Design a protein around this ligand. Sequence first.
Ligand SMILES: [K+]
Ligand SMILES: [K+]
Ligand SMILES: [K+]
Ligand SMILES: [K+]
Ligand SMILES: [K+]
Ligand SMILES: [K+]
Ligand SMILES: [K+]
Ligand SMILES: [Mg+2]
Ligand SMILES: [Mg+2]
Ligand SMILES: [Mg+2]
Ligand SMILES: [Mg+2]
Ligand SMILES: [Mg+2]
Ligand SMILES: [Mg+2]
Ligand SMILES: [Mg+2]
Ligand SMILES: [Mg+2]
Ligand SMILES: [Mg+2]
Ligand SMILES: [Mg+2]
Ligand SMILES: [Mg+2]
Ligand SMILES: [Mg+2]
Ligand SMILES: [Mg+2]
Ligand SMILES: [Mg+2]
Ligand SMILES: [Mg+2]
Ligand SMILES: [Mg+2]
Ligand SMILES: [Mg+2]
Ligand SMILES: [Mg+2]
Ligand SMILES: [Mg+2]
Ligand SMILES: [Mg+2]
Ligand SMILES: [Mg+2]
Ligand SMILES: [Mg+2]
Ligand SMILES: [Mg+2]
Ligand SMILES: [Mg+2]
Ligand SMILES: [Mg+2]
Ligand SMILES: [Mg+2]
Ligand SMILES: [Mg+2]
Ligand SMILES: [Mg+2]
Ligand SMILES: [Mg+2]
Ligand SMILES: [Mg+2]
Ligand SMILES: [Mg+2]
Ligand SMILES: [Mg+2]
Ligand SMILES: [Mg+2]
Ligand SMILES: [Mg+2]
Ligand SMILES: [Mg+2]
Ligand SMILES: [Mg+2]
Ligand SMILES: [Mg+2]
Ligand SMILES: [Mg+2]
Ligand SMILES: [Zn+2]
Lengths: 118, 150, 43, 305, 99, 110, 154
Amino acid sequence: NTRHIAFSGNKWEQKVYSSHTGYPGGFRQVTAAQLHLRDPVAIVKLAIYGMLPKNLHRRTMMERLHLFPDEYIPEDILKNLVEELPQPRKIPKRLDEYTQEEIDAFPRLWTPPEDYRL
Amino acid sequence: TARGTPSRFLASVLHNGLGRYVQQLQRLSFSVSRDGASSRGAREFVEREVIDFARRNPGVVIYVNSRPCCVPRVVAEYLNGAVREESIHCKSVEEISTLVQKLADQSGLDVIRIRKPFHTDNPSIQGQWHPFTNKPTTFRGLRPREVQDP
Amino acid sequence: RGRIPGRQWIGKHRRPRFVSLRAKQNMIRRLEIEAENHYWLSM
Amino acid sequence: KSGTWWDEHLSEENVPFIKQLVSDEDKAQLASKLCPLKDEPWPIHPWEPGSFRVGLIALKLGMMPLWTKDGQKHVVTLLQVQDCHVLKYTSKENCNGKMATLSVGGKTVSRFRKATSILEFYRELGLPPKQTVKIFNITDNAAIKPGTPLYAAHFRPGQYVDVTAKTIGKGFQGVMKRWGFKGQPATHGQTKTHRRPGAVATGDIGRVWPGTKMPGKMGNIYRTEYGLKVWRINTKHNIIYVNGSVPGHKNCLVKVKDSKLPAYKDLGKNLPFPTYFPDGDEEELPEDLYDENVCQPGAPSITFA
Amino acid sequence: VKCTKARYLKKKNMRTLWINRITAASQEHGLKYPALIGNLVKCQVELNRKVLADLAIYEPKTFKSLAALASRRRHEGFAAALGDGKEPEGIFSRVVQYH
Amino acid sequence: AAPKNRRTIEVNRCRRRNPQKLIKVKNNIDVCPECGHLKQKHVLCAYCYEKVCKETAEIRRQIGKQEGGPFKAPTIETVVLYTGETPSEQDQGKRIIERDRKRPSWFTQN
Amino acid sequence: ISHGRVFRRMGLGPESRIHLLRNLLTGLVRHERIEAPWARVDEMRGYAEKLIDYGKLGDTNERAMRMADFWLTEKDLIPKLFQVLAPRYKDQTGGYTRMLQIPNRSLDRAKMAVIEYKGNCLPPLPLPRRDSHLTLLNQLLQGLRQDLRQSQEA
RNA sequence: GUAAAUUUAACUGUUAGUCCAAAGAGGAACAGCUCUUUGGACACUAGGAAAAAACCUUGUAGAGAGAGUAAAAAAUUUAACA
RNA sequence: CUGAACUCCUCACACCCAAUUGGACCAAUCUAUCACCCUAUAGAAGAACUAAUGUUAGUAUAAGUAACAUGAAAACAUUCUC
RNA sequence: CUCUUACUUUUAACCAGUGAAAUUGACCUGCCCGUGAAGAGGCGGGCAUAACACAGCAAGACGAGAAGACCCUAUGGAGCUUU
RNA sequence: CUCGAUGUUGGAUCAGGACAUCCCGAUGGUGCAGCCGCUAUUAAAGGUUCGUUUGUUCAACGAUUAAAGUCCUACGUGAUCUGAGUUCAGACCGGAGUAAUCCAGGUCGGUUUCUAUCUACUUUCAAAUUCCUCCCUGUACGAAAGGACAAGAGAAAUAAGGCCUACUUCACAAAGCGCCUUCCCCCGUAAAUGAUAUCAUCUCAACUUAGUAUUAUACCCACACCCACCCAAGAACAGGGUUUGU
Ligand SMILES: [K+]
Ligand SMILES: [K+]
Ligand SMILES: [K+]
Ligand SMILES: [K+]
Ligand SMILES: [K+]
Ligand SMILES: [K+]
Ligand SMILES: [K+]
Ligand SMILES: [Mg+2]
Ligand SMILES: [Mg+2]
Ligand SMILES: [Mg+2]
Ligand SMILES: [Mg+2]
Ligand SMILES: [Mg+2]
Ligand SMILES: [Mg+2]
Ligand SMILES: [Mg+2]
Ligand SMILES: [Mg+2]
Ligand SMILES: [Mg+2]
Ligand SMILES: [Mg+2]
Ligand SMILES: [Mg+2]
Ligand SMILES: [Mg+2]
Ligand SMILES: [Mg+2]
Ligand SMILES: [Mg+2]
Ligand SMILES: [Mg+2]
Ligand SMILES: [Mg+2]
Ligand SMILES: [Mg+2]
Ligand SMILES: [Mg+2]
Ligand SMILES: [Mg+2]
Ligand SMILES: [Mg+2]
Ligand SMILES: [Mg+2]
Ligand SMILES: [Mg+2]
Ligand SMILES: [Mg+2]
Ligand SMILES: [Mg+2]
Ligand SMILES: [Mg+2]
Ligand SMILES: [Mg+2]
Ligand SMILES: [Mg+2]
Ligand SMILES: [Mg+2]
Ligand SMILES: [Mg+2]
Ligand SMILES: [Mg+2]
Ligand SMILES: [Mg+2]
Ligand SMILES: [Mg+2]
Ligand SMILES: [Mg+2]
Ligand SMILES: [Mg+2]
Ligand SMILES: [Mg+2]
Ligand SMILES: [Mg+2]
Ligand SMILES: [Mg+2]
Ligand SMILES: [Mg+2]
Ligand SMILES: [Zn+2]
């Protein structure tokens, strides 16, 4: 599920990935959104490739990295799994995901007027 | 260098010192000259020091060959078969008395770089670490997102 | 982009240096010592 | 450990026999595919918007003038279809692409000069080897059974096509003929500098940009000319009269297919789909198929009245 | 010259290696390197990086005992920070004095 | 333009000993069925072609002793005869070249 | 770019090329066999073939006599063309010459070739011979042929 | 509180100075500019400021698969109005 | 918490500045007297070379590169082309 | 020249034979930005990257060649002129 | 920094890049009726003429153009060129000087070497830009004079990539003066609904629309018969054909 990553702030619009084809006028600059729609695994792949040591071993470590946009995984790679690492970020709950217990547990703070149209 | 030289791991000869200590120095061969200023310090070592040195080390066979020579040498042979040749050219008795004793204390193993300052044949007692050492087991040994009884 | 004219840390137009948080604490730690030195040099 | 050819150990009596033997087999193999609608053809779907059918592989004969009914003169290129068949078919899934591929070959060649792996592919297909094999991207509703023959009536007059071929090889050439550089003047002091590129880059970068125009080998690459219409179709010899010139030399194999230009989009509604089958045609076609604005040679002289 | 200056790098790179191996063995037990080293010193346990990293490889059951001790002394420090001195010190927070 | 630096023997061995520089083995060699010497499949046998030239030269030396000068070629055909042969039925009215030698076995009379 | 060029560039120019080919053809008509570089013979072989065609036209045709007079530097060979060579190939319509490759010469290791007029009075060259019909492979094919012929008659 | 100093005897080399802070002159309250003064560093080692002669930390020399430290990381997000 | 050649720890200690200056050792050679598989004490001196577009010699790089050469056939007699 | 083109010859390239010269601290001799004796293949942060010949090109190696002839200095020279 | 050498004017050749936009595109304001203009926002894909005098860069002038942009790149580029100028040795004029000789001076003349070792590069494969004409139309606008935009159609130029039927240079072929083909967009703003602020309000409020392409698709895709020969393939190598290996 590398297609459902979430950026903080306005990084989808502000963040830019720049490359060069080597030819005159071959300098390209796209935003994270443009790259994500074109390659749903490039953002996560480029962040990891920049965190690995700047040496010859890095391209060998990236062959041992397997990215999939959706939750589908091949059988072979799915038969040799061992452990699932916990998500670092805790996904907050939408207001439609709270049960009627927590909603009534949280107290009301103010008393709206009865003559208000709202 | 280290890269320009060989190396070895710290070791002993026949697990020496484990059950008993056996002196590895096995033979000493001196070559002094009756005449010659180079051998003056070696001649005085043979008059008062060598006899008292043999009393303390009865397992070492000492040979004193007095012959014409310009450079006196002492050859030390060890149980393991190693042979170290050294020169006592123009050395005082005090310098030759500490040298011969150094040879008796050594084991014969090549005097080269030693990789580790320690050696143990049984490094672990609770189990050498492996990836699954500190991992918990799951019910029915299932894998991440594996459908059971399908 | 981002050239500092001439040599970085000399001249008219220098590369700006900013005070970190530990640099402040390091200076405050020194001050607390010398402030206590004034007390023992007073009797 | 010495290589051999097909007639190295044969005698004077077996060389003529072997030649005629394999020649008669090719005749029988080619004359056994003329009835594709009776030999368990695949389903024949109709034409739907957004459908892409196969193309052909023709041979460039030459060039011929052509006049219209307005008096204007047009030059056309003669593309002859000879021994064109469908070799294999790959589905969208197995294609690893949006479309599905259909393989087509042309111009039967000798079996004595081909690779073993290639010979066995044709052995089970029931066809002689082909010189050129090109891949066409089609839709699921245009798949044709392998071994099916293909003819020039697969196209119609008034239809635009895209012809692809290798360009004439001119070898290593300088910048004046390869890139159109002006060069240097002939006189006024010029010293051994008349057809040189001059400066190749600036001094600051200290290098030469990739893609810099330099001397090198020109031609002998694949090029495509889009927007060529079919003026005339001969059915007796399977010849296609295409407008204008096409890349490549005479007697060269070219790839032909419907044009991708948006202006000619969805114009195959009145065309054969998937392809033209003469075996099952309810009525044979005329000798030649002309366009409305073409004046045939037998027609009377033009008169602006 | 390189071999003579390399004797300072060897000592530095060793301690860098030990710390990297201790950091890894502490995360297996939900600890960070500063919380292990700092709280083992608070228990008067003077074990260096070299030994600790050796214990993490060849004596894993003893290294978890050291991590559990550090986590215990770390939790006692928080408990004492919540009180105003009235509550007595923890069992593992006591310090042996040497005269 | 002059070399900026000296090229090393390591660099030069890779250029000199590149397979393209090396000589390529030939597989078109075979034995001549007549003499048993070696030959190429597309080239004539050097040994058998040489014995034709030795005899052909002797025949051309005899032709000169008959012409006895330049610009004296005949307007008829020519025939070569050896010790133990006479003009054939078809070899009538021709220029016979007598050879004081036994007819080569490979030389077949036509 | 040389597409379609059939003639080679030898000698010192177009005229010198014709003069080199003429000296080889003249020696080929006198001796009926010569050895020369492979390229120079392959280029002259065409002229030796068309020279016989002019000799079959007869010595009474002025055009044919103007070709031989030009292409034959030695004038005693002109009657030999019309009276000896052309009659020999009267029945044949082509293939008057055979060209064969020989070992490269020692001086410059140049590719060589021998060319002669068929029907000459010189010791036969060691021509290449095809494998005998009595070989294993040809006997397996001879048997295959018989059946294919026997089945056809049936 | 410290251990240097002066004199006597006998000599060589240095006498083409760089940045930083401070007080000033000239210039344009320009210069990696020029000219004096006070002090520091460099022209010797190491660590840090990204790379770094001149900024900060730090000096007296060896080995060690021990330890405690020093200097040492950049922060900020904006305009309603009766 | 990390972090030096700062400091502590085990052991050792003359063993990190240009010019200049002071001092302790020493290779080889000759001589005196010893020595006698190569040394000793002294006395002497053409007494020590990673560098002077250094001198001589050898061999590399450039480089198997630039450049150099023989008119044709044939019987080697001769003829032919220019 | 607009605006070049075609052919011949020499050169060329391949085979064979013969076989120089300036040059060269060592080299396992990439690109971008920045840094810096102030213009980096060699330093810092990044990107790129199996090995190898042949033929071309002349942007860079502050490319080779000649201890700059311009300018200044030397109590360094010389030629010419002169009250 | 470089004088045990960093070759310096302009031009030719090839151009890389910036936007502070000369033309083409999209917008707001106007003392914008319209046709022409002024001004600002956005946009660097594409393009930006031929000549007379001058060594010239500039400048003036003539004829054009949709426009004939400003700058950097060692005042880009001389191991690619050019040498008119500047900048040695000759000489003349005027002036200075007793003379030798000299001048911001003017004038005529005057040798531009290098066989590429390394780095880099040597097919960024394929979506194209603009003018004019007809028409709309003598329509909107406007007192008059005057005179549009959009839609549509046609015909050219340049550029890129190809070809030889004819013409032309030529003649088993190579060429242009000849012929054929050429397909997407870019964001400045203008508008609705509606809170903070119960009106209103295009919203760095949630939101809606003009308004957006995974730039589309196209091209390429088999492999020891391969000694030899041939070729529209080619420096060599490689490649294609030989069912035409006397
Ligand atoms: K500065
Ligand atoms: K560069
Ligand atoms: K031409
Ligand atoms: K260059
Ligand atoms: K130079
Ligand atoms: K200079
Ligand atoms: K508002
Ligand atoms: Mg700088
Ligand atoms: Mg070609
Ligand atoms: Mg020209
Ligand atoms: Mg010249
Ligand atoms: Mg010229
Ligand atoms: Mg002074
Ligand atoms: Mg002075
Ligand atoms: Mg200064
Ligand atoms: Mg430390
Ligand atoms: Mg210290
Ligand atoms: Mg010390
Ligand atoms: Mg000695
Ligand atoms: Mg000396
Ligand atoms: Mg030496
Ligand atoms: Mg020297
Ligand atoms: Mg070379
Ligand atoms: Mg040459
Ligand atoms: Mg050669
Ligand atoms: Mg040099
Ligand atoms: Mg730089
Ligand atoms: Mg090269
Ligand atoms: Mg260098
Ligand atoms: Mg000088
Ligand atoms: Mg003098
Ligand atoms: Mg130099
Ligand atoms: Mg702008
Ligand atoms: Mg532009
Ligand atoms: Mg310039
Ligand atoms: Mg030049
Ligand atoms: Mg240059
Ligand atoms: Mg001049
Ligand atoms: Mg005068
Ligand atoms: Mg002049
Ligand atoms: Mg003149
Ligand atoms: Mg060159
Ligand atoms: Mg209009
Ligand atoms: Mg509203
Ligand atoms: Mg409202
Ligand atoms: Zn033979």
